[PDB]
């Protein structure tokens, strides 16, 4: 508990990774034409956040 921080037609993309005790997040947003699978094309994700937290992540879960 030693840390806290605050700040189908749409595709939201993200990347999450942990390196050298820093936990990094990236993203991109776009409209899409066909919702049945990820659209074949290219548009790179850009960083949002680079957290100092030092945690050993091995598993994850999602909320809705």
């Amino acid at each position: 508990c030693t840390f806290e921080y605050v700040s189908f037609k749409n595709l939201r993309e993200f990347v999450f990774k942990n390196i050298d005790g820093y936990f990094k997040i990236y993203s991109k947003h776009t409209p899409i034409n066909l919702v049945r699978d990820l659209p074949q094309g290219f548009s790179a994700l850009e960083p949002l956040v680079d957290l100092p937290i030092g945690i050993n992540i091995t598993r994850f879960q999602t909320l809705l």
Binding site: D20, G21, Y22, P52, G54, N56
Partner: peptide, 22 residues
Amino acid sequence: NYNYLYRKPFERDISTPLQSYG
């Protein structure tokens, strides 16, 4: 003083195994 104690880069782990210094 018993309040100061010991057991990847910049990792932290509070799980338990711990000993104070003397």
